């Protein structure tokens, strides 16, 4: 019946995927000259957080950034001169994510209190104060990203995502289909699609305008902790806790390469690409970050300046610096 018909299509899909595998990315890129050795040295170190750090997001001007810590603070920095600009106190001390609006007027936050809060930075005759509280999820928030000054996409631990409207505080649409907690998401360069990785080892490609899933990728073996588009917009990468990364292609609808090593047995907390899409930077539970090669799957540098687990990682829009955060309450700018 319905159950039997379900498995009939699950085997048709694999046949279609296997027919288009003319060759592998490793085979095609054999003659590319190796990138070599890449060494980065710390340029700035930011101090002031009283506890471990979970979130960090760069500004669009490549100069300011925001950070979130479990002591209940949201500090806005100034990387060029190492000067604190703001420090917003939080009502709940369990914060798990943060974001920075493209226009810089607003900053979002959320955590174990099931609520997303927006703070109006550039206000007249006063300080920063909360502007709107968005409620309706039934699980801890995992991520949230700004589309424009009036819309935001959030994902929570109730196996669902939602698209909000900040002006009215209502869920314009909701996305369902995951069977486990959703752990991260990332918007496309043109903000027409986004991908989300969950705890059932599966990633999907949603459509913001319509509100439906389009593709599903199931290459991993365990929980997925990070996700990020390629700069092109036609590929993305994932990072799981079985010490493996993978590169997926939307058009080919299947996996292309795996970034794994025999000497690594620790989980991955975050991933990020480079400006030109040639390097892939990843974080690890073993206190240091490794730099891969997108087209070769060969390690080409290690960043080992942290004394505890690395929890967040980001690259500026102009591709000039790399910011990392850890559980020892220190940020570092590499270049």
């Amino acid at each position: 019946q319905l159950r039997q018909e379900a498995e009939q299509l699950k085997n048709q899909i694999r046949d279609a995927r296997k027919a288009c595998a003319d060759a592998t990315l490793s085979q095609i890129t054999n003659n590319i000259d190796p990138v070599g050795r890449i060494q980065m040295r710390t340029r700035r170190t930011l101090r002031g957080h009283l506890a471990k750090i979970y979130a960090m997001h760069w500004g669009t001007d490549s100069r300011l950034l925001v950070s979130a810590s479990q002591d209940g603070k949201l500090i806005i920095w100034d990387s060029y001169t190492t000067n604190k600009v703001h420090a917003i106190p939080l009502r709940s001390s369990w914060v798990m994510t943060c974001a920075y609006a493209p226009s810089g007027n607003y900053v979002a936050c959320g955590g174990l209190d099931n609520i997303c809060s927006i703070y109006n930075l550039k206000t007249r005759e006063g300080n920063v104060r909360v502007s709107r509280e968005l409620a309706g999820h039934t699980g801890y928030l995992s991520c949230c990203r700004f589309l424009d000054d009036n819309q935001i996409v959030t994902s929570s631990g109730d196996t669902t995502c939602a698209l909000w409207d900040i002006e009215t505080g209502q869920q314009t649409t909701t996305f369902t289909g995951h069977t486990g907690d959703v752990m991260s998401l990332s918007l496309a360069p043109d903000t027409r699609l986004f991908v989300s990785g969950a705890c059932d080892a599966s990633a999907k490609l949603w459509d913001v305008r319509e509100g439906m899933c389009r593709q599903t990728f199931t290459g991993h073996e365990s929980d997925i902790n990070a996700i990020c588009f390629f700069p092109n917009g036609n590929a993305f990468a994932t990072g799981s806790d079985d010490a493996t990364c993978r590169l997926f292609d939307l058009r080919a609808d299947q996996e292309l390469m795996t970034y794994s090593h025999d000497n690594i047995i620790c989980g991955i907390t975050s991933v990020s690409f480079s400006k030109s899409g040639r390097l892939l930077l990843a974080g690890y539970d073993d206190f240091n970050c490794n730099v891969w090669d997108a087209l070769k799957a060969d390690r080409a540098g290690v960043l080992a300046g942290h004394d505890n687990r690395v929890s967040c990682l980001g690259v500026t829009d102009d591709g000039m610096a790399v910011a990392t955060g850890s559980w020892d309450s220190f940020l570092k700018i590499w270049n």
């Binding site: 319905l2 018909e5 379900a6 299509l9 699950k10 048709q12 899909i13 279609a16 995927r17 288009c20 595998a21 003319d22 060759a23 592998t24 990315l25 095609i28 890129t29 590319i32 990138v35 890449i38 340029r43 700035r44 990387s79 060029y80 289909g177 899933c213 389009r214 593709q215 599903t216 390629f230 700069p231 092109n232 036609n234 590929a235 292609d249 058009r251 080919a252 609808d253 299947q254 292309l256 480079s274 400006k275 030109s276 899409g277 040639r278 390097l279 997108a294 087209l295 690259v315 102009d318 591709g319 000039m320 610096a321 790399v322 700018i333 270049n335």
Partner: protein, 50 residues
Amino acid sequence: RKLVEQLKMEANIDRIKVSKAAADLMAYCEAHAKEDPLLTPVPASENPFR
């Protein structure tokens, strides 16, 4: 019920060869490798963090 309908939509989608996708990604990387400050170290004159 829902799954049967869902995989019905995912079954009928056009797919291109893996070679074409690999060639396109490598072409993009080769074209944009020039303006990557992290791939090739920049002069110290224009490094705001140094």
